[PDB]
Amino acid sequence: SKRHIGPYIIRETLGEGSFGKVKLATHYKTQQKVALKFISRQLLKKSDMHMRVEREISYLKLLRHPHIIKLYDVITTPTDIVMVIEYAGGELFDYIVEKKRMTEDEGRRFFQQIICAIEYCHRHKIVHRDLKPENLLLDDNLNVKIADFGLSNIMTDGNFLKTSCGSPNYAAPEVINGKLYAGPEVDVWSCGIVLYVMLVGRLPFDDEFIPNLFKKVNSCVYVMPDFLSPGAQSLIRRMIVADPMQRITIQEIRRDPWFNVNLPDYLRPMEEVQGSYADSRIVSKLGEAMGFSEDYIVEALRSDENNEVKEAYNLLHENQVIQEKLEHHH
Incomplete structure (x- = not known):
């Protein structure tokens, strides 16, 4: 490659996963190590399956638990879709x-x-x-x-x-x-x-x-x-x-x-509780990762029940509460 991919400058290839190499990288300003998992778009097409992956991953995009390795981001390059995995x-x-x-x-x-x-x-x-x-x-x-x-x-x-x-x-x-x-x-x-x-x-x-x-x-x-x-x-x-x-x-x-x-x-x-799906702090976020659109999201959250969205809201909310209990504490 160019030695770089997003904020992450490559540093060494750690191993080989079926669909590509697994590389070690460090955020270019922060130094944060991170694991770059490579998925070949070529090979994806070849297997008559890319849809279950494309979504299995935009899904992971929103799991942020302290004891489960995080997917920080998905970065697609002309040749690979690369998952930025917690190190x-x-x-x-x-x-x-x-x-x-x-x-x-x-x-x-x-x-x-x-x-x-x-x-x-x-x-x-x-x-x-x-x-x-x-x-x-x-x-x-x-x-x-x-x-x-x-x-x-x-x-x-x-x-x-x-x-x-x-x-x-x-x-x-x-x-x-x-x-x-x-x-x-x-x-x-x-x-x-x-x-x-x-x-x-x-x-x-x-x-x-x-x-x-x-x-x-x-x-x-x-x-x-x-x-x-x-x-x-x-x-x-x-x-x-x-x-x-x-x-x-x-x-x-x-x-x-x-x-x-x-x-x-x-x-x-x-x-x-549950109630008020009316927080714009997480509404904005539900876009960035889940993809989708604001009003669509804003709409989904008036409904009188559970879309995939009146729970990705609650998921981002649960992640928040346990991140607060982690840091605003000893």
């Missing part, structure tokens, strides 16, 4: 095994970040729900950043060929007898697994004597290390339940006493 150099599991076994105040800190992240999805019907070690990133403040941008282990390892369960590059489509892989209760199962791993250091379902030997997944998990508190066991026991239907939901996880201990304010539950 994060660490991987949660790497930290797990270095710390080996964490304290409860630590496991819980991380766990709250993850549970709140996927609740924000479930609530805005997003599918940013792939939760494998590669998707669980960490920034310099040890904050979890869930990443589902088909980035493999590029930002952590440089390894763009890492793949795991649930992906076509990993295994055949039929292996996953699940179109229900989009069930909210799958995210609770995975989250239960991560919690155990963070708190215990090893994985569950292990033969009790032989080290790292997978045994079986019983209907539920009875015995766990005694160093795990009763609050921690009870919660895990309620997440790693075989039958999806007997599994706890994130609504309940969020009312749980254990889970709530030390919950940072910007993460507290919000049982929102």
